[PDB]
Nucleic acid binder design. Structure first.
Ligand SMILES: C[C@@H](O)[C@H](N)C(=O)NS(=O)(=O)OC[C@H]1O[C@@H](n2cnc3c(N)ncnc32)[C@H](O)[C@@H]1O
Ligand SMILES: C[C@@H](O)[C@H](N)C(=O)NS(=O)(=O)OC[C@H]1O[C@@H](n2cnc3c(N)ncnc32)[C@H](O)[C@@H]1O
Ligand SMILES: [Zn+2]
Ligand SMILES: [Zn+2]
Lengths: 418, 417
RNA sequence: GUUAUAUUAGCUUAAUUGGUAGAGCAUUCGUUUUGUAAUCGAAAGGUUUGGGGUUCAAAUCCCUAAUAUAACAC
RNA sequence: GUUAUAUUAGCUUAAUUGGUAGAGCAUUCGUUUUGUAAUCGAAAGGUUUGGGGUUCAAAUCCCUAAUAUAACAC
């Protein structure tokens, strides 16, 4: 939070305003990061773990929330929506995507052949959290979940949760590095449904925990009102734990919505529903990212990937060399004709500091902003037609690379999420 | 509407529900189109027209909306938000992004050196439209604008507006094919600001209209309460006109929020604001596409890009050849290892219909869904190790290798075809 | 929400015990043309989060509203 | 919001200005192994958008709520 605010000020990441407490503004550099993470998650979800993104309403009539049980469970924690006409039924601004995905499931007849049916959803969610509980980006009033719900059969539940934990291991152990433990969170005192169903639901998660081999801890009575959950817990540099990813086993909402599919014996069965998020919310995940990296973004995430600095800022040969590298790496098009920007090209975040200042000043400035690479161009470089390029960390080990070597180096960096 | 509904049912695009009137559900196939359009627009805005995307709140306190003028003026159209507390100040769910973008501009000291300053915003908007004016995807209560606001100087206004017209032309004249005319929508009965400022704002748009050479007509009293505008009008197949893209010249909101920047003379000046959108709303734009194409999407947009049909659904050599092409074209990874999906690969929407049914039935099914391509595999194809591939909009067949189909689809997607 | 503590220019901050709102960084202009962590100079930016009061005088004391941070509550 | 019309199985629809809901597509299983616009068969899916009223009897008539389509209003 204090760390978040320092990095945000240095890098122009975010802003807040009392005219909308607990909602973030992502400034252009903040949104660059936000979007890259979403792009990353969407790729894994659509093209590896078999998810299908939907786009759902944000407001729903009171009746819907009464059906799902939320209007009950979270009555104060829900923002209410009204029209100028006092006769119409009131609305709720959504704090969860799941009743909407239940409406989708049950709008048409479903066949066992389309299960597991996996829906992802990146809608903004609103929760009227207690003002005293709000905190930077970790606990907000408006936030974005990398949300998904799976509809499946009893025999599918375990592999679906193991797949969900695979994606969690890819995020927290491989791409964004022991790294977490699981809270097994059981039946709360306010719950819906039969104690026998709840007991069976807890039984499943217990056996999954055992087979997974992963470290875990009982977290009594902190389950969702509709189901027990596996809560993935990360520790920040002050030894504080934070719930991010989560897998929730839900036998209750399919019952509230009377969800049905037809199986091979030509009869109707009730699906089981799995709630799941891997980032948790994009905002909280970003806060923990910053807490750990202190502004030192990996190359592929960095809103400041390289800066180019000419020793002599009014020298034509240096300038022309700097500009040409910038045009190459940004890979943009001019606004004055009609050729459109193609899909799936590379574009890198490369700036050109030609302020009339000593080189050491501009370098100092770029180090404070945590540029991944520093590219200096002087008369030596103009002769060689190579650029002098420095990584953020290794101040000593320079390289002299051509235009195309830097291009290829950067592409290789993004391919490998490095 | 009619047409939208039929096509939506055939391709499982969208869904509605009385529990949220005037909001769309995009089913997986609908959402694929939605996201591809946004993807297209973001590339143009970021790598050609110098926009920077922002993500902003959805709800703001009454006070903000009173300062912007929306509270008095767009009083009917605004959903109110409240909490259980009731001593707290009321919120409005946003019908526009503009005041959020003014808060961002005004939040920190600004220099003339960062102008033109261009924010793009794709946030969901809500307006409480009259129930009797609601219609399919053209008029909704919730919708997404490809919104943008430009902050600039007086000498920059014309070139910034010409650049917006350039993006409009790429969209309506080249990628998604006079294609439109412009409504010059002037000062409404209820407006904010000075008469003298309004007159100057209309003078500027008149001159632009002249210099642009484009067809236009007067649309009296139809401006926004904060500015006159140029409204891009397209005509549907029943000859009814629809407003899509729009360009709005705003002197008033910067005065309301007292925005300023510092110029070369170390002095404070007020920026001018241009409002713009090119699709208008993604929803209304999709609606007009469907009206135009009757569900026959161009390849790069089609949720149904190719279907693969084995003649003999239990013949192992025919299945292997179908399955191998699907894997190539879809280019997906398996969920059992730790290897992540890399950025900027190609992936195509390719299905395998192995239903134990006559070839002609499966082909009729695929034609009804308007697949761009139909790929048949029989014994002939196994011998040749080539696939029989037929276009939707055509008689003529081709026999191509796996690799040729891959490259063909990439060239179609590359050239937005 | 409650308790505590705060809110001073875009950011960070000073104002000896109510008595001069003062700097640094960033910005604008001039100057310097610079080889891997800060050329030099000037200008501008404040009525101290908003609204009331007390006093000859308020950033400082009193009432109120709003946020933020931290704990609790939930 | 007003006016008109409508709401029947996932979808499209039929049903003596009152008489006791039928089918096509899709789905599930069986059958067919199919060469470019629909193999054959069976099963399941309806208490007619919600609520109230009239009647011996309501998909049908009346009132009302919700939504959709169209036009107007804005
Ligand atoms: C996973 C969803 O489908 C499920 N219905 C759900 O909402 N679970 S949740 O309430 O526990 O939210 C999941 C994660 O969102 C994040 N989250 C929850 N509330 C907030 C908040 N107020 N601000 C920021 N992030 C939050 C946490 O990481 C949490 O683990
Ligand atoms: C362009 C924005 O920055 C500006 N503030 C604005 O809101 N202009 S607007 O009101 O005219 O909206 C622009 C476009 O959104 C689309 N739009 C407006 N209202 C709706 C609606 N109720 N449903 C669907 N699309 C809408 C139209 O295409 C319209 O041209
Ligand atoms: Zn959920
Ligand atoms: Zn606007």
């Amino acid at each position: 939070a204090t760390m978040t605010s320092m990095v945000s000020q240095r890098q122009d990441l975010f802003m807040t305003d009392p005219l909308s407490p607990g909602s973030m503004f992502f400034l252009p550099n903040g949104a660059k990061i936000f979007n890259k993470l979403i792009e990353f998650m969407k790729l894994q979800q659509k093209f590896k773990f078999g998810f299908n993104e939907v786009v759902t309403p944000l407001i729903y009539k009171k009746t819907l929330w009464e059906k799902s049980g939320h209007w009950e469970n979270y009555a104060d924690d829900m923002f209410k929506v009204e029209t100028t006409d006092e006769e119409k039924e009131e609305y709720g601004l959504k704090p969860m995507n799941c009743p909407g995905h239940c409406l989708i499931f049950g709008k048409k007849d479903r066949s066992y052949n389309e299960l597991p049916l996996r829906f992802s959803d990146f809608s903004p969610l609103h929760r009227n959290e207690a003002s005293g509980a709000l905190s930077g980006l970790t606990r907000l009033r408006k936030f974005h979940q990398d949300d998904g719900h799976i509809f499946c059969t009893p025999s599918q539940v375990k592999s679906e949760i193991f797949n969900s934990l695979k994606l969690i291991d890819i995020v927290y152990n491989k791409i964004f590095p022991s790294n977490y433990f699981i809270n097994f969170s059981t039946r709360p005192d306010h719950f819906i449904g039969d104690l026998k169903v709840w007991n069976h639901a807890e039984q499943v998660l217990k056996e999954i925990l055992e087979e997974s081999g992963k470290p875990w801890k009982l977290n009594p009575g902190d389950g969702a009102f509709y189901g027990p959950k596996l809560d993935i817990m990360v520790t920040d540099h002050l030894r504080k734990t934070h719930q991010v990813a989560t897998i929730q086993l839900d036998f209750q909402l399919p019952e509230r919505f009377d969800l049905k599919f037809k199986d091979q014996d030509n009869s109707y069965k009730r699906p089981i529903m799995i709630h799941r998020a891997t980032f948790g919310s994009i905002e909280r995940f970003m806060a923990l990212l910053i807490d750990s990296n202190e502004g030192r973004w990996p190359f592929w995430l960095n809103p400041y990937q390289a800066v180019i600095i000419p020793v002599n800022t009014k020298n034509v040969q240096q300038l022309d060399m700097c500009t040409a590298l910038q045009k190459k790496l940004r890979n943009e098009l001019e606004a004055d004709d009609m050729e459109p920007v193609p899909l799936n090209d590379w574009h890198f975040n490369v700036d050109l500091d030609i302020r009339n200042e000593p080189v050491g000043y501009r370098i100092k400035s770029a180090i404070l902003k945590n540029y991944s690479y520093l590219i200096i161009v002087g008369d030596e470089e103009v002769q060689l037609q190579k650029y002098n390029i420095r990584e953020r960390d290794n101040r000593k080990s320079f390289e002299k690379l051509t235009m195309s070597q830097i291009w290829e180096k950067f592409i290789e960096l993004e391919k490998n999420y490095k």
